[model samples]
Target: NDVARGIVKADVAQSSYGLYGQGQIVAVADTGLDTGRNDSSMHEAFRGKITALYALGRTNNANDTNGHGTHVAGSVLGNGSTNKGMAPQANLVFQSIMDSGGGLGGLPSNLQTLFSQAYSAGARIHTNSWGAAVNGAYTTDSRNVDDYVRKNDMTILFAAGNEGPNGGTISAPGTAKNAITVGATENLRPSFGSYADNINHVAQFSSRGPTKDGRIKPDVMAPGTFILSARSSLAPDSSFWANHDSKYAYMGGTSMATPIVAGNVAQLREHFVKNRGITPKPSLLKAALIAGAADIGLGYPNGNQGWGRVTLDKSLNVAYVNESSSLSTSQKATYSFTATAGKPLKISLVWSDAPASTTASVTLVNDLDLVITAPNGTQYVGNDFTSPYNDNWDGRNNVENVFINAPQSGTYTIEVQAYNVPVGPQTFSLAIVN
Candidate 1:
């Protein structure tokens, strides 16, 4: 946990701004929580912070028989009897989606029912660490995920799956365009030897993308290899953390990375509410994460790293969000940014695109192009990445990224021209950071 936290430098949020996710509520849909001996024996790390718990799909027993939900919850908001969680003070609303035989059956057909329930319970950020094993398949489940966010304007994060070292291996729901999909990166613990050597490299098991329909995905990366967190006493100990401690366990997957991001999202959301006096939508959250991401030299908008590793120290309070801004057919929205000479300026545009059919070749519904005009009259376009002058405007994606490496110091003219908006007044989110 220490290595994982230091990689993103999340501890700075506690020291610098005193932001410990005090007023935040994160919704988790997973196996189950640690309800060992009734509520009394629940993991001490999550003792008082669990506001609500329920077995959502099949079995009524919400005891975390599989241990994953407890470990995942601990990753998000556990209070560190063993090790610190990303946001230890954040409250939780846990929903167990396991079946009678401990398989992940009896899952809700429509995702809206589950997410809406969480939103009503005062949750804005929902993190999911489970998904179907099908690679790069955008099922009805994927569309359902998109529809829920499109309707509610909430934030969702999903694990990009561990079926990787291969391209187009991203699982369902993670393929959902609106949700912030997380991939696993190697931890910085040298004790793990060669596997843990490079914290900047993406974990080979972390899924890659160009999500079947050509969307740059696993939107951000985080440490997932051999991560340590709270253990569920109700479940048996695994070899991962058995040698180290009885109260904690070490697990590795994109599953581990998902909650780390959820915890970071809570901190960012809490920062805006407590400091900026505004609650941002999911699109803004997505935009900010991508805009201020740390480049691991994998190149932006690439399959493995997507944007890059999401670092909270640099991302929060720098980017802006607008849920009300909308565009019609052939209409454009304008924003100006002060660009520095050497520092790279990143801009992200995102929208909760309408649900598309599984049969459609292209999933992006409302196409909005991002254009940046430099002080020297040079131009940059969204997602024309890993180049000196990024300028082929993306026409297939609803999410556009414009990262300028070296800019002449001046006010840059940034524009979001609507090339096509079949729907009326396509509302969007924009983020910019220098």
Candidate 2:
């Protein structure tokens, strides 16, 4: 039950929350959908949940031809009784950006049209399972995605790419400053006693990154290798579907990993809406996911696992989580929380950074710093990785995280300072977990 791997692997099934992404709308931007398939093979999860479909090609008909789109969609919101997806109750909107040849097909540029169409259709989460070369640099596509995220208050999830075990291979769009970049991991045991053994290791094919700008990327990881999903009707018999039944097939790559995260995002969004009576900002969701991630003990936030394997259940269990806020010039917001002697102190700060200027080499617009002071006067500065016993910071990146494994027992103070705010009133979201 690889389809259930995501659910069991993330431990969502064991939680009492019972959130299957109700009232959330996720947009899948890829080749297209297999809406043309007949009932026998039609995905039951999409029985009545597909609210809209748009094509960037010549016609409005958004049907899958290369098979990639259908599989990706199923991973996020499929409801087939045989192979359900991460969020079976979530709604979907498909935007086809490729042709039968798996090329651009002279359609509207994806960076401009897909997001607008999806947003117009009232979708808040956009999932992209495609990308260009592993340039490890922010491009126009990346900037545009971030622009849509901040302006529309939407969440975007991009596949970190399938470049490999070697580092510095994250592709465009996944390099977007605000979108959640997801990498692929292989789940070792379907039923494990703990998360550490459940999400055993990162897939060898999943991309790694320290963006050309040296920002640790691939914000999170998910089960991607050998994922089973809906098969496109138009997909050739010689393809991966050759040996499998016409209704489904198996595939892998960061493309498959992305929808898993997108589906998880939908659940998180729904949880916020129900509990807080307000839509959660992209930053808070990012922070909670990052802060609660299971640190594989690979030096915390290494290139391979930015934070670590995403554990949705772990995040939901933590207390004292806050969403979006604006910090005026020189304004500092402080949060106080207690840290047990043996328990770890994890905190994350993320913001919808201002759109990168096309003219400047620097991408960050607002500079917010995070400082944590323990009861013993041990100060951890944002992005300072020199101390082996204290905290590790990566200040150069838009997202700042400070984590301490063995913290002293007492009340700790966390400060979010506007280090350099050329843009007045910078907005951010912070989360603390102990």
Candidate 3:
């Protein structure tokens, strides 16, 4: 109920949106899932929708023994038969990367194979609920994850880790240049009061950022606390998993938050495919989610909350949206659009950044800038440290955003300039909301 309530409070429930990620395949790379069970709570949402299961060394089944994978899978698309998933109608593809003891089971070399297998099997969105510790280096692991995303044209969601109340704590894989790193929020509903009043507060355990290469991590936030989803009877008995029964379990952490974003990604992809007959690009999807995020009073790109809490309703129902492609060094793409004086204008830039070098200290392979010039000749450069609202100019490699609150009514010019692309002729996705 809490899971559905959180989605409901965000206005993303299938009931209101009329879409439930139909015709989409979402992949989960984790400990695996409890699919062999005939139990009632064994994920009806994924029932008959599990297209494939790639267990790393095993040939047969992908059953969850630690319960973490099942719980994570449920959050992505669990039907309400026992608990609700954010995108309950989306198909699932499972990959077992951890052992029954919750330890690393797959060889380091197999990581790439796992992603490749999922992609070859037609999985479009991959959600990962695991990560390394608060290491301050953008290791090869991070680069490999980005390579899979760039090579396969897929959106991969990673957990921001539970090491929080600190800075520069994002983990490997989460540090991937193209990874949609997600942070956790309390998503609490008081014993009595409006549920909206209980949201937007960052969880204490949710990691903070300014990644090793100085990029804003946790590109977005979502409900991750006290999330109720499927429980694996095969899960080893543990006190850490509270409020458990045969069917459902309650858990917390960015692990819980990652799938919420992944599920929404599937939802957005379904909307685009069904209504517009367009396959939504991963970069544009990231831009839309960031542009549509609720500020929740946090300053944009804060170390704790990146852009803000994500809301699909706000993103999909925006007044205007535009994408820029075929960008190159020494080239700038400009978008001309009119805006109302008082309405807010949000612009976000994202790209499938070229894979970073394993030996380089900095992980950003290409740099792009976003600029906005109002009708009044007010120039807002990308990563401008001095602007009140345009302060997200953090010199980030793959993403940039400019948001304006009280614009002068007239035409506004939006520009995406290639600041430095060692490799020429790069493609980027830009999203504009007016």
Candidate 4:
């Protein structure tokens, strides 16, 4: 019952601020969207919100032959009449990457084409829940995802694949440095199924990561077990639906988790446009979401649940956002903020690094560092803290954050240092909160 609103606190974000995904559109590249062939038989929850739908590669029609796209779309934009979704007021642009034979391999050869189709249709965020099963391999698809995001300013999310609780198993495009690779957190609803019973533990099927290139991945976690979303009328005998219900069904995996966060991204974008009167770039989106993530008691900056479960309420209305200018090698930007004694402080710095090659050993093209100076003159570097707030330096990954609890009250200095920018000036975003 807690799938859409409770875990991520979308209910609070909606009720408190009316952030119901108004004026937002998100793209989903998946099996296909179910429009019941004639577009007149679509589910009641998705009525009038499917902005446009297309079937690319081996498929000629946009009808969901396998029923996956409908569920994903339902999680994205179901308007809560018959069923509910995270962003009920949001619109959707769907691309069917499924084939005529109902396989997911019907995708276009170019990843840019797929994302561009939605981007040109007015979607700045895209969610992808399918990829090859290669564990942590930086494939051509990973590179293409990074390449497309580099120029397009889109916040793309990918399922970290359902390989295991094992490390180094995040799949293809989820290995891309820029995409928000999401892992599945157990929803704790034993009615569906359960092995690992801890809410703090990632689902057993949720792939863990240290992307073969040694980057912590599956950047965040979302509830995926037994998620109930819309069911396609076209694919009736699937058996996974709740008692073969006509409108809703239960599904799980990182596939289900990725779009849940993608919906959160839509609401965050909506708040930006309607409330703040600006569209945040992808880096700010990433920074704010990760900074606001609650640690799964695995501490911070771990492989599984990179910043812990995605909480829309915690992420909404980031206190301080810096999207100013660029940084070259050795250049730095500094800001100051006041911190209370007992409250936690989080500082996040994220840069959209240049695209690296699939053959490269290290994927971080631009290296930026986050350093927070405490009132006592000690410095805490990003992603370099251990349990109870120990500090050091992290030279890998374009995303860096530092969280400290019960800090001394005073003005804290936050610095973003361009440690080694091999690709010239790099634009970055910083989000700080207490």
Best by lDDT: 1
In candidate 3, where is summed lDDT lowest over 10 consecutive residues? 189-198
lDDT tens digits by residue: candidate 4, 142-198? 888888887886899999999988888989899888888899887766655563255
In angstroms, the error of model 4 at 177 is 0.9
* Candidate 4 or 3, higher lDDT: 4
Q: Candidate 4 — which residues are off by over 4 angstroms?
A: 36-38, 193-198, 236-244, 387-391
- After superposing candidate 2, which stretches have Cα over 4 Å from the reference? 1-15, 37-42, 105-107, 110-112, 189-198, 241-244, 318-324, 383-393
Q: Any idea what lDDT model 4 has?
A: 0.80
Per-residue lDDT of 338-408 in model 1, one digit per residue for the tens? Answer: 87887777888888887878788788888888888888887888888645545466766667887777768
- Candidate 1 — which residues are off by over 4 angstroms? 36-38, 239-243, 386-391
TM-scores for all predictions: 0.96, 0.90, 0.91, 0.95
Prediction 3 global C-alpha lDDT: 0.75
In model 2, the Cα lDDT at residue 116 comes to 78
> Could you tell me which residue pairs clash in candidate 2?
45-79, 45-80, 383-393, 383-394, 383-395
The sequence of per-residue lDDT tens digits that candidate 3 reaches over residues 46-132 is 566687866763435567777788888888887757676777788888887775455756535636777778888889999998888
Q: After superposition, how far is residue 399 of candidate 1 from its true place, in Å?
A: 2.4
What TM-score, to 2 decimals, does candidate 1 have?
0.96
Report RMSD for candidate 4: 1.9
